């Protein structure tokens, strides 16, 4: 679902294609704001299981005490807030692909349960001793340095070596050549649709700035910048005065 054919993304696309035909776990890393879910979905889409579900669990966007419920499900009354019975991500993903995003947010107890599940396919809903099984292809992702997490005792060593089979390091936006403006154009059209505007082009100074700035927040930061421009301005062309801070200030 990536845009562009920059040299470093070509390498990513070759690994996606080759990995897609295997069930081996993929382990994605990259700087803040790189497209980890886009990569995971591309692997699923290229795989023989593309017609089955792709499910992404963002472990950070769930309270830590509730990741297990989100992942494995829960029976009614399993814990104080369990108003009903819940199907876990692993069931939603059966015969498909499960992306565990921000995986290092899981506590060590949950990591142990995840490792059993990865080894066997077996799991239990929270609040239940009954065993179930599913078949999922795993893709993991993290913004942390997963090796560092292991060294500091926050991530299980056995889990790391079980998961770290096909690593993919996503290129940061500043290294992606012509992709930056191709992505910016796609965002410009989408945000214009969202906002009821009609931006269609960037001036030459804006192109130069977008192609020289370091984008420390990568594609998320680019999305913010295009959103800012389209929300605050009405024109067909993005002009340099429209670019928000601190893009220019930091650039210099
Ligand atoms: C406009 C569009 C929906 C394509 C934007 O999507 C995102 O920005 C997702 S993250 C991403 N998308 N495409 C890339 O080439 N690299 C990315 O990181």
Author numbering: 141 to 392
Question: How do the authors describe this structure?
Answer:
Here, we use X-ray crystallography to study LuxO, the central quorum sensing regulator in Vibrio cholerae and related bacteria.
The most potent of these, with an EC50 in V. cholerae of 4.1 μM, was a tert-butyl analog previously called compound 12 and here renamed AzaU. To characterize the mechanism of AzaU inhibition of LuxO, we crystallized V. angustum LuxO-C in the absence of ligands (apo), in the presence of ATP, and in the presence of AzaU. Indeed, consistent with this structural inference, ATPase assays using LuxO-C showed that AzaU inhibition is enhanced at lower ATP concentrations, as expected for a competitive inhibitor. Strikingly, AzaU binds the LuxO active site in a manner that mimics the R-C linker, with both AzaU and the R-C linker forming H-bonds with Arg 316 and Gln 363. All three protein structures are highly similar (rms deviation < 0.5 Å). Rather than forming closed rings, V. angustum LuxO monomers in the crystals form continuous helical arrays with six subunits per turn. We also observed the same helical arrays of LuxO monomers in crystal structures of the V. angustum C domain alone (LuxO-C), either as the apo-protein, with ATP bound, or with the inhibitor AzaU bound (discussed below). In particular, the conformation of the GAFTGA loop, implicated in σ54 binding, is unaffected by either inhibitors or ATP, adopting in all cases a conformation similar to that of ADP-bound NtrC1. Alternatively, extending the idea that AzaU recapitulates some of the key interactions that stabilize the R-C linker in the ATPase active site, it may prove possible to engineer potent and selective second-generation inhibitors that capture even more of these interactions.
